[PDB]
């Protein structure tokens, strides 16, 4: 009953208005069409580095669930420290 599906690219779930909103949040008047894919591509490489760091913390602690503590520890090294959710 534990159905599984071979990994298909669902990163395309990020839509153009979502990228438009992020661009408009950064004060962008017009955004190129190709960047819509690149922004998701940048999201992929940034996420991949984070989880690769994140899973190593969980593997060392033998804990399956992803803790907010473990995420901050990975982010603190890379410099992307996020205040909140940790103590």
């Amino acid at each position: 009953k534990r159905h599984r599906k071979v990994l298909r690219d669902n990163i395309q779930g990020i839509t153009k208005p979502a990228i438009r909103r992020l661009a408009r949040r950064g004060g962008v008047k017009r955004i190129s069409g190709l960047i819509y894919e690149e922004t998701r591509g940048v999201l992929k490489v940034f996420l991949e580095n984070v989880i690769r760091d994140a899973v190593t913390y969980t593997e060392h602690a033998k804990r399956k669930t992803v803790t907010a503590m473990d995420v901050v520890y990975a982010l603190k090294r890379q410099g992307r420290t996020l205040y909140g959710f940790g103590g």
Binding site: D53, T56, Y57, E59, H60, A61, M69, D70, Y73
Partner: protein
């Protein structure tokens, strides 16, 4: 006991002598410049602190008072990318199994 000796035995933790031996053990007839010796002397010490910094932080996060091969192997995977991580741990587990196989 001293009383005539300059007693200039101040020691700075260095790895140049051990680095030089490694060079001869990977290149049979090759030399190293003393100018380049100072570069690698601080390099390995910096790498030691960086790796031990990961191990110390990892132990503190897990509320453990001990560091063993598990923490450092975690640190090696955590810092070293790609083939370097695969080979560094390969040397790492090679060392521990021979250490436990000695008297």
């Amino acid at each position: 006991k001293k009383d005539g000796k300059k007693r200039r035995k101040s020691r700075k933790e260095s790895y140049a002598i051990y680095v030089y031996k490694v060079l001869k053990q990977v290149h049979p007839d090759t030399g190293i410049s003393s100018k380049a010796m100072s570069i690698m002397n601080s390099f390995v010490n910096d790498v030691f602190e960086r790796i031990a910094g990961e191990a110390s932080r990892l132990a503190h996060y897990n509320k453990r008072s001990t560091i063993t091969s598990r923490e450092i192997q975690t640190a090696v995977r955590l810092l070293l990318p790609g083939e370097l991580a695969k080979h560094a741990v390969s040397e790492g587990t090679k060392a521990v199994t021979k250490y436990t196989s000695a008297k």
